[PDB]
Design a protein around this nucleic acid. Structure first.
Ligand SMILES: [Mg+2]
Ligand SMILES: [Mg+2]
Length: 342
DNA sequence: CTAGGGTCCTAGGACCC
DNA sequence: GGGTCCTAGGACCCT
């Protein structure tokens, strides 16, 4: 009863797309991200920039101190979405069991596939080659018996490579695997785990489930399971979006309600346009707002509401502005909608 | 020197039984 | 006191 799971992942996705479309950017350091004047961060960088230490989520000021010649690009999201739709259609030629996790990556369940003599390794290789043909973008892949190992594997022969983990290899792989490599174990969790002497899956294997449950709740069960190769999550091809959000960080903190109100007047049309692509009648479950202060605390207040309404969002923001700001400056304003359930 | 797009989990009181 | 809704906050994911 062993499944075959592929995780396909595009290499330097946004940057790879800008390089294809402009060959002049191929061996100079580039990154998609907001300027230092806009208080931005790096979305991603190409390998010539990564050589300097440039990483996704790095503050752009830090990026430029490591890499003074970094060329900064704003991003063409329609071009990324187009490449995303194309690779998902390529995925569909092999199976319908496709769970996309973002623009540039998907799980594929090829257990019941008849392609490539049932070889998941050859399927992943054909997919990567087909993506390179047709799109001139490279992809890496991971092959494993469960989702999370397949996703760890797609990183290990990046870029333009793949890695296969058979059931026989699972125990040696896990023994030395850092817990931080499991998707969903982030910096806070890894630091708590490290401070009790837990660094690898091998360490967690020597742990009692009951202790993990008390110390981390349902997360402790996940930790215990994953540390043993256990991951029964099914590839799910019918997930649907649940929310729509539009927010902006200002170049300077704002201190007057008039400034906050002006920002909302520009955010609202964008929220309406994006909601309308998926809900023409603008009917929704909740709507709300978000402020982030200069002490980097953030607050949201949202409520049941039947249909996108600009004035109520202004009204709510006013109340949040008056009631939870406490004299701090504001660096971000956001609008938010929760979608109806079906 | 700290984005913008999201998902999922937790937790207290309201409400219902 | 157990479900379930409402709401707020936070860790985490992707580029
Ligand atoms: Mg990628
Ligand atoms: Mg990815």
């Amino acid at each position: 009863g062993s499944r075959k799971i592929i995780h396909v992942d595009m290499d330097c996705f946004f940057a790879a797309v800008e390089m294809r479309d402009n060959p002049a950017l191929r061996d100079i350091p580039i990154a998609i991200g907001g300027s230092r004047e806009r208080r931005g961060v790096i979305s991603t960088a190409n390998y010539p920039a990564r050589k300097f230490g440039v990483r996704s989520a790095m503050p752009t000021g830090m990026a430029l101190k490591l890499c003074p010649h970094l060329t900064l690009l704003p991003g063409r999201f329609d071009a990324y979405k187009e490449a995303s739709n194309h690779i998902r259609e390529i995925f569909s030629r092999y199976t319908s069991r496709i769970e996309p996790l973002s623009l540039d990556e998907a799980y594929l369940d090829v257990t019941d596939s008849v392609h490539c003599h049932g070889s998941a390794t050859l399927i992943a290789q054909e997919i990567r080659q087909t993506i390179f043909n047709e799109l001139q973008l490279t992809a890496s892949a991971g092959v494993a018996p469960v989702k999370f190992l397949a996703k760890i594997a797609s990183d290990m022969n990046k870029p333009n490579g793949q890695f296969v983990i058979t059931p026989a290899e699972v125990p040696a792989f896990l023994q030395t695997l850092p817990l931080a490599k499991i998707p969903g174990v982030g910096k806070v969790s890894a630091a708590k785990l490290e401070a009790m002497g837990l660094r690898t899956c091998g360490d967690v294997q020597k742990c009692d489930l009951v202790m993990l449950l008390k110390r981390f709740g349902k997360f402790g069960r996940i930790l215990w399971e994953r540390s043993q190769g256990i991951d029964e999550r099914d590839v799910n091809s019918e997930r649907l979006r649940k929310s729509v959000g539009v927010e902006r960080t200002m170049a300077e903190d704002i201190h007057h309600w008039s400034e906050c109100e002006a920002i909302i007047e520009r955010l609202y049309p964008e929220l309406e346009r994006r909601l309308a692509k998926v809900k023409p009648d603008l009917l929704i479950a909740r709507q709300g707002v978000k402020l982030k202060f200069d002490d980097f605390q953030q607050t949201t207040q949202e409520h049941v509401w039947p249909r996108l309404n600009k004035a109520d969002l202004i009204a709510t923001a006013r109340k949040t502005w008056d009631e939870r700001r406490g004299g701090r400056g504001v660096r971000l304003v956001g609008l938010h909608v929760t979608l109806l359930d079906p």
